[PDB]
Amino acid sequence: RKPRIRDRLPKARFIAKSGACNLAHKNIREQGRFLQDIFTTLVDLKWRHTLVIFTMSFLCSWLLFAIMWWLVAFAHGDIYAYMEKGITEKSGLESAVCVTNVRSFTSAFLFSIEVQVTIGFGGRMMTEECPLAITVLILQNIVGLIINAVMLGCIFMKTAQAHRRAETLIFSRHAVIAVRNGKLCFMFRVGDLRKSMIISASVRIQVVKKTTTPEGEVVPIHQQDIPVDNPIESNNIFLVAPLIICHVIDKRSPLYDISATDLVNQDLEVIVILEGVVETTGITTQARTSYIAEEIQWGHRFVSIVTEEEGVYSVDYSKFGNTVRVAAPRCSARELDEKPSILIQT
Amino acid sequence: IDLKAIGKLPIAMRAVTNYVCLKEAYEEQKKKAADHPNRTPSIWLAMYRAFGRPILLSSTFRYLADLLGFAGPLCISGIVQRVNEPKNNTTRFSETLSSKEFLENAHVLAVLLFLALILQRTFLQASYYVTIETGINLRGALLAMIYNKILRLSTSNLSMGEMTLGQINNLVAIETNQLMWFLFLCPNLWAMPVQIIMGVILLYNLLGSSALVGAAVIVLLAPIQYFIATKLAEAQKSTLDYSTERLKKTNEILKGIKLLKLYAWEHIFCKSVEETRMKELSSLKTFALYTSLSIFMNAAIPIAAVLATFVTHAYASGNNLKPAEAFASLSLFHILVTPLFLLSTVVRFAVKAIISVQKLNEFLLSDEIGEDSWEDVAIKVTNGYFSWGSGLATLSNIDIRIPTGQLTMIVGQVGCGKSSLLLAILGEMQTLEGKVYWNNVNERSRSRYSVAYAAQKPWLLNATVEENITFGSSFNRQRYKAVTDACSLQPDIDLLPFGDQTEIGERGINLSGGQRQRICVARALYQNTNIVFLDDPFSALDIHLSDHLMQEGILKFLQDDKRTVVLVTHKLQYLTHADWIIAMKDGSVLREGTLKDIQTKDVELYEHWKTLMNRQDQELE
Amino acid sequence: YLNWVVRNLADLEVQMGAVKKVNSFLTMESENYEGTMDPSQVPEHWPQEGEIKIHDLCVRYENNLKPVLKHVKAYIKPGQKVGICGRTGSGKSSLSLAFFRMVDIFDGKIVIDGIDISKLPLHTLRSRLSIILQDPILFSGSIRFNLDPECKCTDDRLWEALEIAQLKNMVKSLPGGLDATVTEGGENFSVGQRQLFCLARAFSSILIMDEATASIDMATENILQKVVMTAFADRTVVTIAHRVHTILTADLVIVMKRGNILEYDTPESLLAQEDGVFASFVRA
């Protein structure tokens, strides 16, 4: 497939098999990145980064206000009053040491720790002389409570989002097309791994193709829905064991034209989007997969995955995409539909 | 593997530079070429001025990097000598005078060393990063030029047919890689003495008097590597030729897999091959010897050498070996030893570059210039030669004129000229000598700009004929799609290999001579404004009972269309509508009439040819 | 030294990755040869005019070696030199069944070869075989070193190559010499015979055939005359072919069954009345 080798870029893949929306927006009116944005990034961090930002924030606040206290205990002529070793502390009582027994920046830092985290060792108390120190103490406590509350909110919200682990919904990596119950059918396999059920489940199958219109317009990426062929016309589905969600096509759906040779050059792409709310969490989840033309192994049929064990059914998950190539008619999409004189073109 | 990184930078740099830069180089070199070919005419002078890459822009940085690096170890020494000093002797209170006080302090020197080291590394890396960014451009240029000079001049090959793939073997990836490497490596040659030369002087400046001896040995140690290189290369070349023999023998052996799989020569076919391996193995051992020795030469001479200097330390008779005297000497010895390997490699690289430029010069001076001089009828030219290449004479009463849509075929293989005439009718052969007089307009490339053709050898062009159908064809193009659906799939329904009809050609490994000629004719079919030109292919592509089928496909193609179809074939199986023919025998078009008018002249060869019996196949056998 | 360390780590990784590409095929062997056959004379004789019967509904083989996945009854003529009807549907399977082994194909009781067939010493038994490639090209020497076994065969000059007439042009009256071959050519410089002189190679007595695909019909007829000269030495052979140029004067023929011979019937009109050569009659 050297043409495809050089055509690795030319490819109709609207959504990557992972599920993302491989696209490209541009020429948009980016107003900016306002401040509050950064705070949201604070919420959605991972544990190593959250712990680091937490500890760094506490330590930065402590050191900063310790530096401030050091300046304060400098300007009031306090460090000198202590440094006078005429006695153990000869005239250190009357001079109104602004903060009792604050000798050097290390000591002031011990005081910062002692006053922010509400320890309070008592050996070094604020005194009744310097209003500036009282102002800085008030500021210290207000900022301390706000930072404490914000970091607590961060840690809590990373705790309350422990229900979410990962979306685990599984598709057959390949599609399948076959004949069932007398007419052509399109298949796909859907399974689940989580023990919990998925309530109010629903599926939708859409065809993405570039279209043309008789009036003249062309819609580049055209989307059209297709029925999901349940017994009573309803996109509901119970998911205990994995199953086969078959959107059989008659006329209205765009499968009338399909010719077996054309599949390599086929431009239509099938997209599957299903969704529901998880029973034990309360979150509405939505999983999406893409069925490109290269993955549609035509003519196959799916395998059976249910066995009677002793009293309780056993189920495999290894055989998901394995198929047995049951013989089927070829390109009968129009031939069998637009019934020939035989009315049995197969 | 992201292709996002590529962006549009290559168009701005490599695509623009390669084409534009050499244009100036051609203009200057050719302008000088007019004066005389005794001294002025040459090839590589243009590149320096025309490309104008500032090698110096780096060369300056390179010299700077070498100076900084060589300076570094003296700063290392500086700190070391003053390990110990109380230095309160004068009770100095003088603000340190810039001239002296700053150099001495132990603390400063360390920070200076860090700054110098970072700066040197950065400057060096940046300079030769820019140099590489220029080399890449030079390589793109050289390739662009080889194709520009291979396309529009050398069309007609008559002597280059002896070895034309030698050029595409050397100048493809042995020359351009050589020039890119040599340009990227020039700075080492350019500024290695500025550092080395520094070392002896530096060593002499500070080591003492034994420095000259101390570095004497390494200046001769490097020629040891320069001498081992050549012998190792000779051994490697002999080993490579022996390996080629082994590979060819192995190919022949595996080529007989079904014969040797069980027959009485099953294990026998490898016998000599095993000895072959052993034979080749012996050469490998010889090569290994020099390589190991070279490493020893590169891994010992320095150490050995430095010992000598300390021996010559006993020639200094000083107090002792000051640890601030020999540590810096050892640092200089361990730094100097680096660019020597680069120098030794450049020694061979220069020879490689010279050989490459000589080969390029030979190509551009070997018929690469002069082989292409600078109903819509064109030909009224008396000039006689309708001879191949730069061949001799055979010019008599030459002229030609043909109303198109006429199947004029000079049926003859002896004194044939079928290829010279077929190529020269469109003018692509050097037969345009004389006067070229045409109509006033096509409705100056000889008024034949609407050409289309088929070869006289199997074409087998890029990708395959299945993928050769790229003429604005998503699926079907009305003129050839029909022949595409039904004339194209007619010769061989399907090849043995898988994938069938679609992209059949892409990655289509092989072809039959019949399938090759069928594919060629099919590529003749899928052409637009069909005025086809054929050159006697259907005397060798004579597919009995299938030549009529091909001619019927061409019928619905050309005889059921409004189109001109011609051929110079040599078989009479397709002689229907074969009205016009020649039997020139080394002349231009001089035989032309009606379908039977030639037989009116009753030429004996014409009389025998124009008979009922199998169209006189093999003179009416 | 750090740049060296990083670059050398990368280089080592690349080198070992390149090695692992062939270290997976380092010592694998998947066709064993350990035979316990007792000693046999193994002369070059024709045993009983070559009765070949080893297959009755040749069963599905195994081990994925192009198995025949159906049933094909086999019964040929004893002193038969010419081919018998084998249809394209099973023609490839039969062609593979002429001399090539398999897992579970045609195994069983047989009256053939007068000696054990599958248990014979696999190191030497194979030298007694004979086959022909579809389009014979032997890129090997086979002329200068044609006597790889120790023979002074003394007939490659003009004696039995000319008598075989396949190499008469290249041997009896040729200056190539006793030491000169063609480089990778079964048709490059020796186009007169891509298959060498069988008698010279025996100067065994069993011939195995191939399909006329790249040999000119006249040359093929001359090769048929040589095949008749060899048939004087065999008078019993197995042949595989589908076209009249090779199936024109077949001496012994059969009435087939769906892809393999069902019964022995040399003439052609009797096979025509039945379903014998109806598919063969498609051209005449």
Ligand SMILES: Nc1ncnc2c1ncn2[C@@H]1O[C@H](COP(=O)(O)OP(=O)(O)OP(=O)(O)O)[C@@H](O)[C@H]1O
């Ligand atoms: N038992 C299982 N465990 C995990 N994933 C599964 C299991 N069965 C199927 N899948 C998922 O289904 C997808 C397609 O499976 P498929 O039916 O192709 O079987 P497969 O060929 O074994 O898949 P793969 O080639 O991805 O292993 C795969 O992406 C795989 O992740």
Ligand SMILES: Nc1ncnc2c1ncn2[C@@H]1O[C@H](COP(=O)(O)OP(=O)(O)OP(=O)(O)O)[C@@H](O)[C@H]1O
């Ligand atoms: N590639 C070439 N090499 C050497 N001589 C050539 C070449 N092409 C043409 N000539 C000369 O031109 C003259 C006309 O050649 P002509 O066209 O008859 O060859 P041709 O008939 O095409 O060959 P062929 O019979 O193999 O098709 C010949 O005498 C030949 O010497």
Ligand SMILES: [K+]
């Ligand atoms: K909650």
